[PDB]
Design a binder for these strands. Sequence first.
RNA 1: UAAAUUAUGGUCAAUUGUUAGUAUUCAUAUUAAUUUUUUUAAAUGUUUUAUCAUUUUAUAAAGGUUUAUUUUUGAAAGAUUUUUUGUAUAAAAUUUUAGGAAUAGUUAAUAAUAAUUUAUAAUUUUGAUUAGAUUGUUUUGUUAAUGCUAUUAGAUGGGUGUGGAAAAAUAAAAAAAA
Lengths: 250, 90, 59, 213, 207, 89, 180, 227, 255
Amino acid sequence: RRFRYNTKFPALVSYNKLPWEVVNHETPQFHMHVAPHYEQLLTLAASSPVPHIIGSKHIDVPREHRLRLLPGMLYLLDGDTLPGEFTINRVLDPTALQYYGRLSSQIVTVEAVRMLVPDDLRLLCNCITFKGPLHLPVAPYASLASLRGASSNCFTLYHFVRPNRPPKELQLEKYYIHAPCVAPLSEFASNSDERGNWRPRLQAPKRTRRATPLPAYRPPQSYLMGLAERLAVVPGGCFGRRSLMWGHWF
Amino acid sequence: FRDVEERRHSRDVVNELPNPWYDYVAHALPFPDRDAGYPDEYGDLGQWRAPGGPGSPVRGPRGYTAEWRDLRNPMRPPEFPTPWERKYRQ
Amino acid sequence: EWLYYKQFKTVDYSYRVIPELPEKYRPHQSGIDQAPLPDYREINKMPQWAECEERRQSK
Amino acid sequence: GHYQQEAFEARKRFEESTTYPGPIRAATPGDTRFYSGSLESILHDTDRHYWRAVTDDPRVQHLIPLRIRFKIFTWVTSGWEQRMQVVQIMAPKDSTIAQVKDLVIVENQSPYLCVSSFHLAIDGKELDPQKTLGEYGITEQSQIDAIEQNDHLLHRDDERPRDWTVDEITAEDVKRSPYKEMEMQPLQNLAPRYEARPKGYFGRTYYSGMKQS
Amino acid sequence: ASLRYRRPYWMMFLKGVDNWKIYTVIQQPDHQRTEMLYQAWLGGLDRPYTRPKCMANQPLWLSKKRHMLRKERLDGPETPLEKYVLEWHKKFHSFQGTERPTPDDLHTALDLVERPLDLSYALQLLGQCRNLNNIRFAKETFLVFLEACLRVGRRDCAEYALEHAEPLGFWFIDEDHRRYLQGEQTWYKLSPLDNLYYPVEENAKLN
Amino acid sequence: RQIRPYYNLPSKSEHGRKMTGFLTPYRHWMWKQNELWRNVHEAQFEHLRRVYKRQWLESFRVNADEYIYKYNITKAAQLAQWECEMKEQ
Amino acid sequence: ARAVIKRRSPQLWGAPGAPIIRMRGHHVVWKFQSYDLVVEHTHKRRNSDIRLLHYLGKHCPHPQKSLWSPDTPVAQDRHLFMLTTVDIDAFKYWFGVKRCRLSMKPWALLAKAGLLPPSLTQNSKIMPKPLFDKESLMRYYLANRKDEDVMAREKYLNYENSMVKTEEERAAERPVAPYL
Amino acid sequence: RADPLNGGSSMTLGSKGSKLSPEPHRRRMPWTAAKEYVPGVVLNARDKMVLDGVQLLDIESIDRASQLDPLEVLRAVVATREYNISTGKNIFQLASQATYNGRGQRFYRKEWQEGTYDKYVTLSAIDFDRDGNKGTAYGYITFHGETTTRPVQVDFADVPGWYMDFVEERAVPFTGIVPPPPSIGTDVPVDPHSYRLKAYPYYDAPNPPEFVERLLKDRGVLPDTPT
Amino acid sequence: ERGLYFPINHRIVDHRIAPGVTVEETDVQSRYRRELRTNFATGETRQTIAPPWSARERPTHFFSLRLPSRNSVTLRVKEMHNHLLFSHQQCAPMLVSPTKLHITLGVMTIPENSREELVKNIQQSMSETFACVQPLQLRFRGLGTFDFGRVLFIRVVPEADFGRLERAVCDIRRRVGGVLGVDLKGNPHDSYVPHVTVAKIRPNQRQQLGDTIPQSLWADYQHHDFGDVTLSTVDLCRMKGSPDGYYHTEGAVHL
RNA sequence: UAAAUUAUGGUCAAUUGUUAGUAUUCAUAUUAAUUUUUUUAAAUGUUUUAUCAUUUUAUAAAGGUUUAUUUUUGAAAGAUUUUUUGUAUAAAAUUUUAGGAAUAGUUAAUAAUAAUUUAUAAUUUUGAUUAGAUUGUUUUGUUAAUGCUAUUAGAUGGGUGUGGAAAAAUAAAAAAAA
Ligand SMILES: [Mg+2]
């Protein structure tokens, strides 16, 4: 536990303070930090309407207000256009593009990712273009419903963030409302004509035979690190509870 | 193990009897409920003193009151003629 | 285990490794000057086996 | 969360109330400077060292403790590590950003923090130095940081301070400002003693907010 | 069995370094002068230099500078392959280098063989390329290896490589070349423009 | 201590301990059987610990209630005596 | 957490913590030997009185005849007596509220007294340590299983408040008519 | 704390377990957190006598006088390769021998597929440093059909204990991005024919008769006489 | 090396921060002495707290102890003004005229629509409550600040006749704000602190004269002795001094 | 300025040396202790781990202190979980010597100031400061007794400052993650 004020060492000298988390765009850990937020934002946009997420055109801001309004701004465009006064960097690093694998597969295939740096080097515009319609269903009232990319076909997403800042710099924490989709309920809804097609059953069918047993268990032949309960590791070293032992060699 | 043990325990007549060392704890407070033999404020031992004396904490404090009605003159006959011995009465 | 861990001079015999500090650890004060540079004109001589197989190839 | 909104609503209705002769100055006491324990502990303006079982009337705060977060590259033995420092200033209720900058540069009291011009920003958005805290709605719980002139390129090794572990420090470099404070020559007494942590303190990877194993 | 209390906190997780107590007590006058003399003995610097404030390892810059200034063997390269060995060591064997060679570099090194010593150097470089750098081979690496061995006169090296090429990592072995090298065919390749079956000792028949 | 079987993995290292901390799968299985007996006793031990805490809390509650009653009576008597003495003064 | 560990008497998790009940006794001639059940910290200094949370009581490990009792023909009542003086309230307070620990000798003594179940140390060599099988345990669980409601009620009585107030007591306690 | 094994019971010192909680017990030291480990000493104790058959030339030894016959050099290279492979195999050795650095392949250890344990990693990327047996690797760890949403850096990518079976369909070119495997529970509908669970949270394998007999023999309940 | 290793003045711990974030998450760096500087040192005097509704409308009238121009305090502050002007010429607009000095005992806001009936009651209450009190003597010394340094006033230490003055002002507040409804800035059960304003920054002058009076202007005279003055009159006046060159006369009682 | 009693209550105070004109506690007794007749060692390999490492293992004697030695729950106990609540370095009194005089990186204010701020500073004859002696406020011995006479083991500066806490360099009657 940590519930103590600092009185052992002077405040001017930070003697045992944890390092501040900083994200650098020259490293793939930036993509690692940002990609899941992108996929969550896409899911939220496809499920429920989101304000200020749809972009008719590139926003125009004067230089003095450029560092005041642009940071934190994230939206999407139908066309593959890039803002001016930005030098372009293409993702040629397999490690950098690996982090978008879940976004490409489960959500929507990504066409390209580019990092745009202004001449003053005081900003970063991550522009990621996805080619193809969303794999997940898109509600007619959702923000992406107004986007022609769903239902050229490719659509892009722009995100502005100041370089060399803590991971809280991007305001992607607010895009986390878990609005559910109505994909199964739409089938039984009045507008769809499958309500009579669907046949519900109230009683479970009778069972005549027991379930097939597991195959013969063979104890492991290699050496073991010891009991997970005593070693306080999770069952498979990945997840689970220490007390609830399962999925190990025995 | 617990179920088999409790089932075995319930089958014995000698059980289901109170166990003072197990069913309760007598006194949890540190201080006792009455003084016992400890030295007096004057320095006297417990054997040299008895409670209820001046060292004990104080007990505290138009018409006729409520206790005036029950009092009656012994000249008047008693309410209940209990056959008191004359020697004890004197 | 105990025989291996004894000579490291552990006061409590706590299975630690504390190598002894010699009085003269660096070679320069141990008594040697700069490391001798190998004779390059000698190490550049082609080996005798190489000369023999070169002659065999020339055969 | 709930405390801020309920306090604001209570203050609003207290202001709106018109039938009030005013609190009694003698009946309402102030905080005392003398109390048990050998520590001088400052609390909020609504807290007292003595036990006060009654809830006093809300007051408008005339002195907001603005806390500005600066980057600081402390020298650990393993290498330079970037961490966070907090500078606290006591600004009036209607203090403009210009006087806020004056207060932070006068109360930074650190040689490295105020080395160059910087701009105050909140959640990544820069603050206009012309309007006051009233326009921004800044409370005592607001999180404000600062961006210097050369913090946008700190990822470059040239901008990063050069440690003697990997980088060569020259005779002209030992005469510079930070490298004079640092001492590459191990003195007998080792006057510049700094925080030390092992290279494997965080494992094979550095400190991160996520799991990489 | 933890040394966190025996030695200063800054030198935890230190392995390989011998006598860390030297660096713990390096602040003494005699130990400091011994360290200065040892660093001068290693050379590479003009001023009297000592180790940093708290470091049991030599600084990266100093170690790299000493490695680069280190006098290298084989001062006089006779053949172009002899010079290529020097430049390969310069590029892909620099201290703390992240670069890894390529099969194109391996082919260029192997195609410059003229002497049996050149063949030995090229074979050693190929072996270290596949063991230390662990680089996947291309299609024609075995072809150029066979050509080098044939034009240098090393039949036995080719046969030995063929018999267990899988440990060598040669994932492609042509059927024509395997039949030639297993004592079943007299030629292993044909020149496209010349229409002749190598080697020349076999060309003496077909002509 | 922790038992280390003779038939375990021998650490082929001269710079450290001669035996590893791993174990045979049979040793892991037989350890689980032994650890199962440890849980049988401690679960009764833990249950008895909780019921003893409950009993002590209840006894403290009752005895403290009685002591509070008596102490309040005594202090009320003391304060009444004090106010009577103040009037006499 | 020491540069040179006191190898003769080591402990676990440092000092001072985890109060533990032990049996201290000065090493004297066996005929004058008597121990003292007492609760103390894991680490003790040269004198045991530094870390002494509470004193449980004396124990004389000498079987003695019951001279205080009259000479009775009862065979069991004429066996040798091993007298032990223990405290119940403090023991329960330290065991439950503070969750102290116990050593094998005090555990065996308390098991004899009836406060605790028999310790893990004392075992009969005749009976070996048994083994377990999941299928048979599941079969027994299906063969007999208590109701969830009654198990929750008994758990509540054993762990949470057990001195409950019934409707008779509630009706007695409820206010009288004049103040209604 | 986080994982109070068998509750907070403290009957013995071993009742709390070898390690109290998966989180580090001391806030200062993060490395001491509970995590799966493999025997580093045994896995890195490569066979030394196997290199004694033929001498090995040093890299820094480049002078002409120390050069050996090319046949001997090839023998030394074979000896070094078999010396590296003798203890086992690491993903850094399988990646170069698999196409596209083995991206999208399924890597598992020998102990990861024995008993009720069933875990593997779907490779996503590998970075190679100068040494071909070193570097880093990232992938999706899958445990009993459940896979991580985001790629993670694999643990112990250097120890020679890894195995992999090459399949061309799952290979991912550098142009594309390795897709995370679907989850058997959420992503793909469950089907006993496609995949059947080997161990569930409350499962524990039955005691094998050989281990039971060995334990009984050790405890002495079964008769035993020396030959 | 000069003194103690950890001075007592530097053992400050801040409870305004979260408990567990100062040890590891961050380190707060600030000069905590400025906010703990005592009111005696900083010149701040606790004025009666006004309710929000009464703190909006501007005051209309005020009680004062009328004094002759010959009184000692007038020439003491005249010499103080001379010294201040000689030292720095930029504080003249902040400094008030010597002829506009009065000892205020209370401030109130009488609406102009119904002022005529209220002023008669106020003056008759003042007469009936001052028909018995003898002329007061007050010793003035020290400097104080009101409205966060906006108002600079001469402190009135307790002395002879000061107890009678405070009892009289409490009675005046009871008889004016208590029985009949008049907006007193403070509380009727609270006592107003007498003072004479030597310097004050007007809200219109706040634009270019800073936000507060710097302490260095009156630091040397923070504890200056301005002497003993006898007051034998009281006046209910209004904020209008420019037309007649003197205090506006709305009600007067010759105490 | 009145007696006592519904009668021993409320639980044991008791002193022993055969001298030697007188003055004054001073030779020889008793108890307690030391002393002769040979009673009477403080043990050498702590342990586990992921292997050239990491994790657990915190007050023995050394150094002479009389205005003096004072502090934590961040480890552990410790528990569905997350989360949360609090502290604490400061004091007061008792302080030795046959012949008794000066003491000092120094007091207060200020501050995360000042080797160089401001001030009529602070200690002490009500016995200071150095020096000598002695490990401080539950321990014995003697006696009828206000007395007299004893007692112990351990906190002796920092200097990459690990740790919750320095107590951290041989010394057990401490079972220390099966
Ligand atoms: Mg002395």
